[PDB]
Amino acid sequence: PRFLKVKNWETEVVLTDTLHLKSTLETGCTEYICMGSIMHPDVATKDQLFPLAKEFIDQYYSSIKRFGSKAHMERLEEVNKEIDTTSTYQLKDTELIYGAKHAWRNASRCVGRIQWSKLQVFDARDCTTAHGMFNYICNHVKYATNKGNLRSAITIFPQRTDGKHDFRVWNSQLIRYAGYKQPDGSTLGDPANVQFTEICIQQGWKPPRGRFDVLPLLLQANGNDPELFQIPPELVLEVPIRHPKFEWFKDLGLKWYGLPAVSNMLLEIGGLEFSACPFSGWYMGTEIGVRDYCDNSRYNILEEVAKKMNLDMRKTSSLWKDQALVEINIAVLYSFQSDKVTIVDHHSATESFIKHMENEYRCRGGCPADWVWIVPPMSGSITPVFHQEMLNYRLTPSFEYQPDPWNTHVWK
Amino acid sequence: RFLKVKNWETEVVLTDTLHLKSTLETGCTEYICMGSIMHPATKDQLFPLAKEFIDQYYSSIKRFGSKAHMERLEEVNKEIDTTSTYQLKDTELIYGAKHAWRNASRCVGRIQWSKLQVFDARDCTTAHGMFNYICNHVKYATNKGNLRSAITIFPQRTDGKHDFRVWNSQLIRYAGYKQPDGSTLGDPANVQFTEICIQQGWKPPRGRFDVLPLLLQANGNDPELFQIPPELVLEVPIRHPKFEWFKDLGLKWYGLPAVSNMLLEIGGLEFSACPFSGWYMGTEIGVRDYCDNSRYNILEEVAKKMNLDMRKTSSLWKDQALVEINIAVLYSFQSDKVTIVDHHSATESFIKHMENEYRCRGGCPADWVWIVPPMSGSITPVFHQEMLNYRLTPSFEYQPDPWNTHVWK
Ligand code: HEM
Ligand code: HEM
Ligand SMILES: Cc1cc(N)nc2cc(-c3ccc(OC(C)C)c(CN)c3)ccc12
Ligand SMILES: Cc1cc(N)nc2cc(-c3ccc(OC(C)C)c(CN)c3)ccc12
Ligand SMILES: Cc1cc(N)nc2cc(-c3ccc(OC(C)C)c(CN)c3)ccc12
Ligand SMILES: Cc1cc(N)nc2cc(-c3ccc(OC(C)C)c(CN)c3)ccc12
Ligand SMILES: [Zn+2]
Numbered sequence: 001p002r003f004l005k006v007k008n009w010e011t012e013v014v015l016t017d018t019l020h021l022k023s024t025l026e027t028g029c030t031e032y033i034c035m036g037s038i039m040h041p042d043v044a045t046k047d048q049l050f051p052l053a054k055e056f057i058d059q060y061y062s063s064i065k066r067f068g069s070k071a072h073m074e075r076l077e078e079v080n081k082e083i084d085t086t087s088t089y090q091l092k093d094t095e096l097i098y099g100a101k102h103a104w105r106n107a108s109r110c111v112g113r114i115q116w117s118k119l120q121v122f123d124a125r126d127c128t129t130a131h132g133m134f135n136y137i138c139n140h141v142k143y144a145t146n147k148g149n150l151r152s153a154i155t156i157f158p159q160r161t162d163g164k165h166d167f168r169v170w171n172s173q174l175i176r177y178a179g180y181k182q183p184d185g186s187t188l189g190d191p192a193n194v195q196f197t198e199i200c201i202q203q204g205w206k207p208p209r210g211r212f213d214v215l216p217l218l219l220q221a222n223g224n225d226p227e228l229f230q231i232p233p234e235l236v237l238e239v240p241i242r243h244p245k246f247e248w249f250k251d252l253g254l255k256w257y258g259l260p261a262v263s264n265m266l267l268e269i270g271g272l273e274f275s276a277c278p279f280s281g282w283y284m285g286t287e288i289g290v291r292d293y294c295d296n297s298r299y300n301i302l303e304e305v306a307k308k309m310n311l312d313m314r315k316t317s318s319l320w321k322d323q324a325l326v327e328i329n330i331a332v333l334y335s336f337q338s339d340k341v342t343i344v345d346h347h348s349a350t351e352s353f354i355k356h357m358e359n360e361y362r363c364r365g366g367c368p369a370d371w372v373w374i375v376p377p378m379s380g381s382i383t384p385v386f387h388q389e390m391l392n393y394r395l396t397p398s399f400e401y402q403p404d405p406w407n408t409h410v411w412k
Numbered sequence: 413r414f415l416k417v418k419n420w421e422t423e424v425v426l427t428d429t430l431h432l433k434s435t436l437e438t439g440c441t442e443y444i445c446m447g448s449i450m451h452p453a454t455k456d457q458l459f460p461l462a463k464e465f466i467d468q469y470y471s472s473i474k475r476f477g478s479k480a481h482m483e484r485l486e487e488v489n490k491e492i493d494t495t496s497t498y499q500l501k502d503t504e505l506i507y508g509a510k511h512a513w514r515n516a517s518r519c520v521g522r523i524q525w526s527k528l529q530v531f532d533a534r535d536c537t538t539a540h541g542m543f544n545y546i547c548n549h550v551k552y553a554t555n556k557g558n559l560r561s562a563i564t565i566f567p568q569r570t571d572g573k574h575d576f577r578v579w580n581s582q583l584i585r586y587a588g589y590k591q592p593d594g595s596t597l598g599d600p601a602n603v604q605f606t607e608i609c610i611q612q613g614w615k616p617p618r619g620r621f622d623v624l625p626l627l628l629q630a631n632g633n634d635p636e637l638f639q640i641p642p643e644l645v646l647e648v649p650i651r652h653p654k655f656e657w658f659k660d661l662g663l664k665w666y667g668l669p670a671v672s673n674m675l676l677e678i679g680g681l682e683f684s685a686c687p688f689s690g691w692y693m694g695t696e697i698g699v700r701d702y703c704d705n706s707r708y709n710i711l712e713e714v715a716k717k718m719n720l721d722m723r724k725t726s727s728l729w730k731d732q733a734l735v736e737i738n739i740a741v742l743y744s745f746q747s748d749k750v751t752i753v754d755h756h757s758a759t760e761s762f763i764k765h766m767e768n769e770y771r772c773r774g775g776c777p778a779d780w781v782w783i784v785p786p787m788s789g790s791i792t793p794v795f796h797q798e799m800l801n802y803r804l805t806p807s808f809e810y811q812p813d814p815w816n817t818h819v820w821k
Contacts, residue, residue, distance in 0.1 A: 036447030
């Protein structure tokens with residue numbers, strides 16, 4: 001039916017969703033199963049591409065209040081002849097900007113979407129080589145960082161053609177720390193990044209073999225083999241982590257980078273596929289995964305912090321893990337704030353998202369939202385999103401997962 | 413098809429076949445997921461449902477197709493023909509009630525599902541008898557603090573005009589009163605029901621922890637009030653193992669969580685009064701929402717007594733005071749030898765429970781939105797555990813509150 005209702009059980013506020021009617025592709029759920037906690041549940045032909053392009057162009061001309069206009073009809077005819085003759089088409093600059101903002105606006109799992117309209121779009125579709133990709137990525141990092149006053153941005157490289165000429169950033173984020181598995185089984189650096197670290201070493205990277213080695217960019221242009229580049233260290237803003245009360249916390253030697261910039265996702269606009277589209281914002285404190293690091297040869301940060309807090313770690317019901325996790329997250333927010341590097345705590349981010357979601361229900365007719373990903377990884381129920389019912393559905397333009405490029409790349 | 417679920421910490425992959433047996437809907441569609449939405453019989457329809465349940469009962473005792481299986485199917489069929497309903501055998505009631513718990517996708521405590529004490533109250537005819545059955549349930553389940561899981565099942569729905577109902581949401585809850593300004597004396601969750609009890613003749617002590625009276629409805633009659641004997645109500649004063657000032661907050665809670673407003677469905681039959689009880693997970697105990705003074709709740713007051721910076725949210729003072737309150741609850745129950753489980757232990761048990769269920773049953777319906785605890789989610793092992801949610805019967809269902817349906821006599 002046309003209307004779907006969601007309720008906030010703290011405030012009793014009821015919102016009516018009609019935007020779900022524009023949902024495009026399946027969720028994986030059926031009337032008899034829900035896959036809401038499942039992590040994720042050769043190119044387009046001509047006849048596949050015609051309706052996807054028309055739907056995006058219609059949506060674009062509706063958004064600028066020119067629906068059915070002469071320019072709308074002429075744009076549609078242009079796109080159709082272009083697909084008819086070249087099996088693909090090119091977006092105008094305005095449509096590219098529109099589509100990237102709306103892929104962020106449509107990202108159900110993103111709590112930071114109140115900012116969606118302020119995204120800075122860098123058009124890199126004239127790029128032809130990995131050196132040019134490096135240039136574009138350096139400028140993006142410099143612009144987005146802005147000496148700590150972080151600005152959201154995306155850089156969009158050429159779209160996919162036949163599938164054998166893809167542009168790809170092999171990094172999962174533009175800035176991440178290396179991880180090195182030792183022979184004795186322990187891990188030095190970030191354990192999340194051991195596989196990609198091994199790939200870089202294999203491609204020729206000389207690793208410093210420290211705890212916080214910024215990984216090199218591994219960049220692939222036009223389907224060619226990827227090439228390694230070192231980001232200039234002055235472009236990488238970092239924050240040492242200290243605690244406002246625990247003078248010993250700085251002795252852990254922890255730091256983190258300021259700029260979260262995800263680079264392994266695919267951007268889909270009007271049936272066109274931008275397989276290289278790194279996008280960046282600023283952190284929510286809880287995301288910063290400094291928790292997983294190893295302080296010594298056995299204990300991770302959560303254990304090491306609790307040990308220095310003199311907590312009882314023999315019983316789980318002493319809640320020493322919860323107590324230590326709070327102090328770690330206090331330290332993260334204090335350090336970014338003291339250094340004037342943009343960051344948002346989870347109470348502020350979730351209060352903003354509720355305001356955002358309400359505005360979207362009124363002005364747009366709904367807001368696709370993935371509760372499983374929107375609720376913060378700690379203190380869930382004391383944030384306003386916990387008691388908020390949400391509807392999840394897939395609108396396009398969208399950001400999508402894609403397989404890792406080392407699994408598919410045909411080495412030259 | 414079979415569906416896989418992955419734990420993203422252990423990389424353990426479980427294969428789910430049980431979802432292929434579910435026949436009730438979840439609310440989702442191919443195009444919209446509603447996993448965060450809270451709430452998404454005639455003679456002709458009854459026998460298929462009953463046969464379905466009878467089939468799975470005799471499949472469970474490894475006597476499918478047996479003589480007794482067929483005779484029982486024949487019996488249930490004739491009985492629906494002549495009477496438009498049927499009665500469960502005691503064996504089937506026990507099996508049904510345990511599997512309603514086994515199938516409750518939102519319950520993290522289901523490792524215990526087969527240790528459920530079932531009290532058959534299907535001979536009850538009056539609210540006085542309901543009171544008797546309920547007192548015996550509370551005394552048995554409390555067991556001087558060594559809590560034991562139990563359910564008491566009252567007669568099933570007949571024509572819908574004669575339901576048995578427990579009007580309380582839990583057997584034991586604290587009253588909550590509307591204050592002249594706008595704050596709340598007692599539990600804010602129970603203001604409406606407290607007012608209902610006062611309208612019905614209850615004399616409110618107007619305290620902070622007034623145990624509510626039982627409001628009991630038999631055979632569709634007007635409900636009647638009863639005072640649970642206070643010696644049957646086990647309570648725990650909340651104190652902190654480090655903060656000597658915590659006991660000065662004067663808080664306490666009751667030991668026994670006994671939910672009484674849900675509906676049990678077995679083989680097409682509906683049991684609208686079926687209070688069931690277990691023991692608490694520490695994070696459930698809603699003492700956080702009380703008021704200490706005339707403006708500040710326990711969370712604000714705790715942070716105040718802790719001398720935290722309450723001006724910015726990024727000081728995370730709420731998160732700090734939340735953990736301490738939860739340490740105090742666990743310390744207090746453990747010190748009085750009242751059964752309680754922490755969210756770390758309970759979610760650990762649930763992952764082991766899922767392993768068991770996939771091995772022996774082919775799956776386990778699980779609602780991630782409700783299984784993950786309301787604090788420290790990602791440092792518990794269920795956060796990174798993919799789950800499949802689906803609806804099996806027997807089941808516990810939500811039902812309307814009786815005061816919205818009842819025509820007073
Ligand atoms: C501006 C500040 C931003 C904040 C504070 C923020 C916050 C978040 C958080 C907390 C998550 C979940 C993280 C996790 O579960 O590990 C997330 C996911 C996501 N964000 Fe945002 N975000 C921001 C900006 C952006 C921008 C600029 C884009 C794209 C243009 C974006 C697109 C996404 C997407 C696609 C996901 C989901 C990824 C997936 O499904 O795997 N975000 N965001
Ligand atoms: C024995 C110890 C038990 C523990 C520790 C436990 C724990 C929990 C928790 C923490 C919740 C969610 C609470 C919330 O969201 O506030 C829950 C839900 C639930 N529990 Fe259990 N439980 C236990 C026993 C039982 C028993 C004995 C039954 C019934 C026979 C049961 C039936 C249910 C049901 C039906 C729900 C979901 C109700 C709904 O759909 O809203 N539980 N349980
Ligand atoms: C722009 C931005 C800002 C921010 N503050 N946070 C962000 C987090 C993600 C994100 C989070 C989780 C995730 O999936 C997990 C398996 C790590 C993915 C998939 N690459 C992306 C993506 C973009 C983010
Ligand atoms: C149910 C659920 C909810 C949520 N809100 N988030 C989740 C994040 C992960 C997840 C998956 C993979 C992964 O890492 C690599 C294997 C891709 C990480 C990061 N450790 C997290 C898995 C499940 C999640
Ligand atoms: C036997 C048992 C033990 C326990 N330790 N905990 C339990 C919690 C619920 C429960 C929790 C929430 C809930 O619904 C919320 C919307 C308030 C309902 C049904 N209303 C039941 C039900 C039974 C429980
Ligand atoms: C999305 C979600 C997840 C979860 N895990 N839990 C949730 C609990 C409530 C909820 C709703 C009503 C309510 O109160 C009565 C009106 C039933 C209470 C208890 N105060 C909780 C609402 C939403 C929840
Ligand atoms: Zn779903």
